[PDB]
Amino acid sequence: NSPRVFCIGTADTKFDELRFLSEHVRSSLNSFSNKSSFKVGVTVVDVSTSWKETNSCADFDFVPSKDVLSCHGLAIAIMSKALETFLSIANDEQNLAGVIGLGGSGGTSLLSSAFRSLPIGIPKVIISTVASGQTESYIGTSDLVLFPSVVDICGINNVSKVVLSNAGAAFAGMVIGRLESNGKFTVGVTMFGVTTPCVNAVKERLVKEGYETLVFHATGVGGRAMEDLVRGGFIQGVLDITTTEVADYVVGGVMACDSSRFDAILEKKIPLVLSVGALDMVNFGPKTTIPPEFQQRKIHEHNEQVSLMRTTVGENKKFAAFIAEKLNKASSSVCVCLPEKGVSALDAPGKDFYDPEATSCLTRELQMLLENNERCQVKVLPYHINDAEFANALVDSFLEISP
Amino acid sequence: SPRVFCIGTADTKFDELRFLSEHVRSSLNSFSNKSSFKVGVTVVDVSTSWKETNSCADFDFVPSKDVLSCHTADIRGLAIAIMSKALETFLSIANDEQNLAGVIGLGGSGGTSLLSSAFRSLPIGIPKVIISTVASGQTESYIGTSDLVLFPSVVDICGINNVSKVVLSNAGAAFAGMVIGRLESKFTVGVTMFGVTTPCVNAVKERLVKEGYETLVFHATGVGGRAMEDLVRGGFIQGVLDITTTEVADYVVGGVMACDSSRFDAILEKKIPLVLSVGALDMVNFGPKTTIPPEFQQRKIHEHNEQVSLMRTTVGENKKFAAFIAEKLNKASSSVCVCLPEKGVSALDAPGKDFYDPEATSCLTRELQMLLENNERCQVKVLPYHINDAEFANALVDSFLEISP
Structure with a gap:
């Protein structure tokens, strides 16, 4: 032929x-x-x-x-x-x-x-x-x-x-x-300004373990790019540190993933450690294009250009749904890993978007919602997401699942 | 090598x-x-x-x-x-x-x-x-x-x-x-065109091909005009019948299909046969109503299709359009013929049709031959037809066959 x-x-x-x-x-x-x-x-x-x-x-x-x-x-x-x-x-x-x-x-x-x-x-x-x-x-x-x-x-x-x-x-x-x-095993990882400590660390370790890397700036497209290359057959495992794109979806930010987030990875049955990277914020910007349904929330003007909005407790509850839903259909190994203290540079003890009532709700909700599922392990951990000891976890959780 | x-x-x-x-x-x-x-x-x-x-x-x-x-500041x-x-x-x-x-x-x-x-x-x-x-x-x-x-x-x-x-x-x-x-x-010519002038261009396209010319038709959209001028500068288009200069309009009033201050210079610098005309100077592009600069909520607003709206040019505005064209034309270091349709400049500027106003069209005409009277490269022809009449079309093409080799 x-x-x-x-x-x-x-x-x-x-x-x-x-x-x-x-x-x-x-x-x-x-x-x-x-x-x-x-x-x-x-x-x-x-x-x-x-x-x-x-x-x-x-x-x-x-x-x-x-x-x-x-x-x-x-x-x-x-x-x-x-x-x-x-x-x-x-x-x-x-x-x-x-x-x-x-x-x-x-x-x-x-x-x-x-x-x-x-x-x-x-x-x-x-x-x-x-x-x-x-x-x-x-x-x-x-x-x-x-x-x-x-x-x-x-x-x-x-x-x-x-x-x-x-x-x-x-x-x-x-x-x-x-x-x-x-030749190599390429992994792909999802990043945001406020989650690079974690990602930089993991990229480092990954490189030294022998694996090659593809960082994605979780902009929705970023996420989808990743999945379209795994689906293609280029990315042989993922560490979805930053899942903020999900948040922009359930509340309607300017960098949302669409409703198919995760399927491609799970369909391809490849090692998938995951986390709440940046679930604390939904994106917009500038102020006046922000819808008038929440001109009374915790916003943090990052630029004239972009503006971030702090996810309420209720909203995080919804994020735990979406992710668990997709996770529970898991045809092979998985591992969630949660930072308890905070999910983002800004969700930090002392900082502007700090709220552990939020990032505890989000941590439990997913501990419970995934409780039943065999493959999908879960690891709540006594850290903040950027603490490089977390990073060790993620890469270690991944090391476990992978060949 | x-x-x-x-x-x-x-x-x-x-x-x-x-x-x-x-x-x-x-x-x-x-x-x-x-x-x-x-x-x-x-x-x-x-x-x-x-x-x-x-x-x-x-x-x-x-x-x-x-x-x-x-x-031959912010450093980055x-x-x-x-x-x-x-x-x-x-x-x-x-x-x-x-x-x-x-x-x-x-x-x-x-x-x-x-x-x-x-x-x-x-x-x-x-x-x-x-x-x-x-x-x-x-x-x-x-x-x-x-x-x-x-x-x-x-x-x-x-x-x-x-x-x-x-x-x-x-x-x-x-x-x-x-x-x-x-x-x-070979000899490739280009022609500017708007919906409301397609009778004119179509008919000039047809005649020209029969005369043994190739034709390139550019939507007069602002871009289009520059598109054409860059290709004449690069020797792909050896003459131009610039029928529809509506862009010059959206420029002085401030439209969504604005030309820019360089319009015509390329053609003239190349020194190529340029028949020109007043195509759709009767209108200025916007779309939609809602975004139209609030300073005119009283001007004659045509709805073309939801996203796109046209606004009837005033006599003061046509007087200006003349100046721009005249000014630029007057720099001609070679042959150039205007051709003005006495009756109308658009399907929309036609006896019976919304954008009719032969004051505007006489103003424009007079203002143009006034400002070009002295220029002896430019030959301002006033023609007793409408832009879209197939005799104007021949007029254009004749004027062109005249200047050209």
């Missing part, structure tokens, strides 16, 4: 741009092969939502809107799932060597969605009219590239010729280069 | 820079088969720390000192500013020997800012890549209207590891592809 790339667009309206690209890719694939043996099949793919029907492209193996729509603003949402799943499948026969697509606003968003469900490392490219603006929605935590089109996508000219030529070259080199070619 | 540049802050990112450059070299070489010549990879330090780095593996290497030489920023300016000037020189085949870089937040400015001054077409911790955010500041490509770094730049090995590897192969492909190897 030989390797195959996909050139994907809306074919009814952009046949000429897409033929141009497809041609240039196949050509460039061929010109850049060395060790080779295989040529890479270049198949064009239509994802037009219109009733208009184009059923071949040049000579290329082609696949019309239907064949894609068959796989299980609402026009985009349909066809993108169709693509995503259409691509899930081709990945499986195990010779999807890349994806490429062109598109303006609506199309970019369509492709973006399909492409970034592919394994990190498979080359994902889109020549896009909306590359040069705001791309978070499109790229996210993936490695998707977006080539600015410079001019609109309307037929081949002067400019589109070079721009499309360059992106085909780009994509052909990626795909060959990867056809024509880890 | 051709040469590429791997540019970074060696001081802190040495391993990643070397790895990247190694992969670029490999990929260059392997992809170049079949062929001869062979592309040099030059590593270059754009570090602002004093920490000196003087080599990297076996590559022709240029440290900070040597960059900073050829350059200032140091970035200068390093960036330095780099820009270093690449220009690199490019003058016609031997700059490509440029690739790595950066975090500040590094993307440093590399970006410097890379987008190089001609469209020369491969320009950056692997960046801030690809997956808000990139207009960096990419502007250029072909700069930002690959998302996926994790931090933070030593070699599984993830950055594959990302860096795909970026270097991407880049080596763009570089070899390009190494191995």
